[PDB]
Design a protein around this ligand. Structure first.
Ligand SMILES: [Mg+2]
Ligand SMILES: [Mg+2]
Length: 754
DNA sequence: GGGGTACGTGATCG
DNA sequence: CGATCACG
């Protein structure tokens, strides 16, 4: 026993075998388990029914499926004893084949734990936790550069560079002559791909770091390897990287290794308008990175001139991907360990799903039958359940306070749990203020009980940190207490998460109602100190001392948190999040701020996406800069009025009017024909190979009808013959981009034109 | 060699 | 309107 890095299962003679991938004293070891059996639970109307239920049959892969063994078990459901039947199956793929046949049965009240993947079922049931121990993993960052031309089919252009980096340095493999110390010149695209395969197998990294390798680098490598008739044996069992369908996007796994894609991780952890590698690197390390755009890479490759610049960019991409991976992996590894699921899965999950995985493991440990995920009907009804207005204008010297560390303590002290809510024949209860929900005090609730243990464990870690003289364990314990804080602070939100198993609307409302008493205290104490509260949400607040010096606002705020935390009982804690030079607030989670270092931080306002024209994105950036960098809302209004007049008078270049939208299906599969699909159908008719992945660039022209009938492919646009729709670019592009921002200053859509 | 098929928001279609 | 579709 060393350190579990992953778990999966393989089929042998039609039977499942669990594979546990381990790292033991620097050596890769694979353990096999043939004895663990898949199962579900069935709640029956009467014990007699089991004789009919155990005889239920299904079909899978032409062969019939049966219930292997049945076992009567006593468990806890909704904080009540319950008798259910454990229905054993031969193979985990038998469960989706037979579960609906069992649920359909007249004697079956309900079925449970029927959507838990087999490898996760194993980890939970066997009490196995990944990423435990001091085991030191090896890492390798990998990146690729491709030859791309406007609106090409995914994979048409060859891979022209492959870069990798580790502690030994950053290297580039290319198949054109470049005279640089870190460049390896091979003969072909085929030999460059074979070289990457060789590097990976020889370095044998435990972790492969990419920046959006799930959707770009690995699908592209696989497509080009296919075209070239070569295999990619990157798995430690010599298997090829496996593309998995996660939502509408992809996820790539490399067996026996951890494919650590930084893109989903950084997107969750930090707030940015764009997640370009350059923006991300500057945000984390405060250092600038140069970008070489796709068109520049194409020009250099095709001409053979300026290739040294392209190779430096490729090398830096790998080098910074390595630095970022080493920065963000320790926290992902501690979250994995805390929820008891592999890094690959954990790094690609929301906190709501991390809470559910923690709860599922703790439910097994406590013999608690887990509730089911809602059906489409129940999921929609939860979204429909309904259950303070910001200060207008531009504010200077804004202080940010965080409330989130208040709620776990409220859940624990008031025993807020779906299993304690409105229980019959309960002797003592807590009543939520205003909402009136009653929570039984007769037993500790499942969630309050888990939260208490989490918070106690964090206090123990913090105590070990103060009393430790070792900087190495202090670093590790710091990630551990941080991982707990992240998990504990996600419970409040989870009660209201419509896809949650332990979803509880009355729990969320009650926590909000009890929480409000502390928010009202903070608000009152701030206001008596001369502070003006500009924005308040359940998460925190923004305040300033109108007309005060910035150092004075800071000093008073820091002194205020120190004071309030000394008045608030237990682990109830207020946090000073930060300070901002300027800011404005539109509504709930719609605001924009600027720090003292000139970095603009926004929430729910920016439109930095390819399906918005450059004119709209450029105008919005200019409006935000006029307001936050120049403190000038009159400048911002003049910007909009000038841009809209320029659109009216056909003074805007057509290149700034292009909309880009991806084709995601065969064209016949579309139900609603949007502008990009109408344009795509016309291209296909012209002989163009239209395939999913293709990005359609179009311009909306002047005329009668919906925009779809008036959209033209950019390659077909002729400035002499065609006239763009100025009304569409004004009303549907530019004004929507700025109208929300300017509403915070008293302007309506009508006020932003001449 | 498997395996749960994000999520939240806004636009344009029908 | 609800339904469909795409962004990151
Ligand atoms: Mg897996
Ligand atoms: Mg790159």
């Amino acid at each position: 026993a060393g350190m579990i890095i992953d778990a999966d299962y393989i089929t042998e003679d039609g039977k499942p075998i669990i594979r546990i991938f381990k790292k033991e004293k620097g050596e890769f070891k694979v353990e096999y388990d043939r004895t663990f059996r898949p199962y579900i639970y069935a709640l029956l109307k009467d014990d007699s029914a089991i004789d009919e239920v155990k005889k239920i049959t299904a079909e899978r892969h032409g062969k019939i499926v049966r219930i292997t063994e049945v076992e009567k078990v006593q468990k806890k459901f909704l904080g009540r004893p319950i008798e259910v039947w454990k229905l054993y199956l031969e193979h985990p793929q038998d469960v989706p084949a037979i579960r609906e046949k069992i649920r359909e049965h007249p004697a079956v009240v309900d079925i449970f734990e029927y959507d838990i993947p087999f490898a996760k079922r194993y980890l939970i049931d066997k009490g196995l936790t990944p990423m435990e121990g001091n085991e030191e993993l090896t890492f390798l960052a990998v990146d690729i550069e491709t030859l791309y031309h406007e609106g090409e089919e995914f994979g048409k252009g060859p891979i022209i560079m492959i870069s990798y980096a580790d502690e030994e340095g950053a290297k580039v493999i290319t198949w054109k002559s470049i005279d640089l110390p870190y460049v390896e010149v091979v003969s072909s695209e085929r030999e460059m791909i074979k070289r990457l395969v060789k590097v990976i197998r020889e370095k044998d990294p435990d972790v492969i770091i990419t920046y959006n390798g799930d959707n770009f680098a690995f699908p592209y490598l696989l497509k080009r390897a296919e075209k070239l008739g070569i295999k990619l044996p990157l798995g430690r069992d010599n298997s090829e990287p496996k593309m998995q369908r996660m939502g509408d996007s992809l996820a790539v796994e490399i067996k026996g290794r951890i494919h650590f894609d930084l893109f989903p991780v950084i997107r969750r952890t930090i707030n940015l308008p764009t997640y370009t590698l350059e923006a991300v690197y500057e945000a984390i390390f405060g250092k600038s990175k140069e970008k070489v755009y796709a068109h520049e890479i194409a020009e250099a490759w095709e001409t053979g001139k300026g290739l040294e610049r392209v190779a430096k960019y490729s090398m830096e991409d790998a080098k910074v991907t390595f630095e970022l991976g080493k920065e963000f992996f320790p926290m992902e590894a501690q979250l994995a360990r805390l929820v008891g699921q592999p890094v690959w899965d954990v790094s690609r999950s929301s906190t709501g799903n991390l809470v559910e995985w923690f709860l599922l493991r703790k439910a097994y440990e406590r013999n608690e039958l887990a509730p089911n995920k809602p059906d489409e009907r129940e999921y929609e009804r939860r979204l429909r359940e309904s259950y303070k207005e910001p200060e207008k204008g531009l504010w200077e010297g804004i202080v940010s306070l965080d409330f989130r560390s208040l709620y776990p303590s409220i859940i624990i002290t008031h025993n807020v749990s779906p299993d304690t809510l409105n229980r019959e024949n309960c002797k003592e209860y807590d009543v939520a203020p205003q909402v009136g929900h009653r929570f039984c005090k007769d037993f500790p609730g499942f969630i309050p009980s888990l939260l208490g243990n989490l918070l106690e464990e964090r206090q123990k870690i913090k105590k070990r940190m103060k009393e430790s003289k070792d900087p190495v364990e202090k670093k590790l314990l710091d990630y551990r207490q941080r991982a707990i804080k992240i998990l504990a602070n996600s419970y409040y939100g989870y009660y209201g998460y419509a896809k949650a198993r332990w979803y509880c609307k009355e729990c969320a409302e009650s926590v909000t109602a009890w929480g409000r008493q502390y928010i009202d205290l903070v608000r009152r104490e701030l206001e008596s100190r001369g502070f003006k509260v500009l924005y308040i949400d359940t998460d925190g607040l923004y305040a300033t001392i109108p007309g005060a010096k910035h150092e004075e606002i800071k000093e008073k705020a820091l002194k205020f948190v120190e004071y309030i935390n000394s008045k608030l009982p237990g682990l109830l804690e207020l946090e000073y999040e930060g300070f901002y030079a300027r800011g404005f607030f539109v509504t709930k989670k719609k605001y924009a701020l600027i720090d003292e270092e000139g970095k603009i931080v926004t929430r729910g306002l920016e439109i930095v996406r390819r399906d918005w024209s450059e004119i709209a994105k450029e105008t919005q950036a200019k409006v935000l800069e006029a307001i936050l960098k120049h403190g000038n809302v009159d400048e911002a209004v003049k910007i909009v009025k000038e841009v809209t007049e320029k659109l009216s008078k056909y003074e805007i270049p057509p290149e700034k009017l292009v909309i880009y939208e991806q084709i995601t299906r065969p064209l016949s599969e579309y139900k609603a024909i949007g502008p990009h699909v109408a344009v795509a159908k016309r291209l296909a008719a012209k002989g163009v190979k239209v395939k999913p992945g293709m990005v359609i660039g179009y311009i909306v022209l002047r005329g009668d009808g919906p925009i779809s009938k008036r959209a033209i492919a950019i390659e077909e646009f002729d400035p002499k013959k065609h006239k763009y729709d100025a009304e569409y670019y004004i009303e549907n592009q530019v004004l929507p981009a700025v109208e929300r921002i300017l509403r915070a200053f008293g302007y309506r859509k009508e006020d932003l034109k001449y």
